């Protein structure tokens, strides 16, 4: 996260870190047995780390659980990043508490102008590389599709939405992928892609979760 702030230990209880010997993506806990992330974060042998703040220090509230199965969206297109969403089922149910909680799925889609919270352990520099060990936070608004496309020239589908500041300076970045975008208490987006980080007229692009509620619910009910 670029231009954000230190969230504070466990203030984002649904935030998860996907670990394959090292942190490589974020994710969101939607219930005791399931986590949602981006399809481009797919990897074999994933260990889900919940209740994390400093990812390099055992602080006492962590739960390390291996993934039993991963399901990438049936129509995920790695070239355009369309349908960039994936579900991960935990080998065992997580213990829910004040530090580890689930985030609600949306009922309706969020509209332009709505403020959202984006979090992650990704790069903090727009130019250069500097990875934080503690969770970073960023409040950013949803931009209208027209405003986004006109300014960025990005090729976006109806399964994506932009959020951020056209003036630049604040944005998600590498390492934040798969992370949550929460607006009004609901998971409305997943950190998906963009052009560089925090650049002018180049806001972040996120997977529009409200378009996948049916798939998510049906998949978890049958698995």
Curated annotation (Swiss-Prot):
Required co-factors: Ca(2+)
Cofactor note: Binds 1 Ca(2+) ion per subunit.
Gene3D superfamilies with a match to the protein in the record: Trypsin-like serine proteases
Post-translational modification: Subsequent cleavage after Lys-125 leads to alpha-trypsin. Further cleavage after Lys-170 yields pseudotrypsin. A cleavage may also occur after Arg-99.
Active-site residues, as the UniProt record annotates them: 40, 84, 177
Species name: Bos taurus
Disulfide bonds: 7-137, 25-41, 109-210, 116-183, 148-162, 173-197
Keyword Metal-binding: yes
One biological process term in Gene Ontology: digestion
Catalytic activity, reaction form: Preferential cleavage: Arg-|-Xaa, Lys-|-Xaa
Superkingdom as given in the UniProt entry: Eukaryota
Entry protein name: Serine protease 1
SMART domains, A to Z: Tryp_SPc
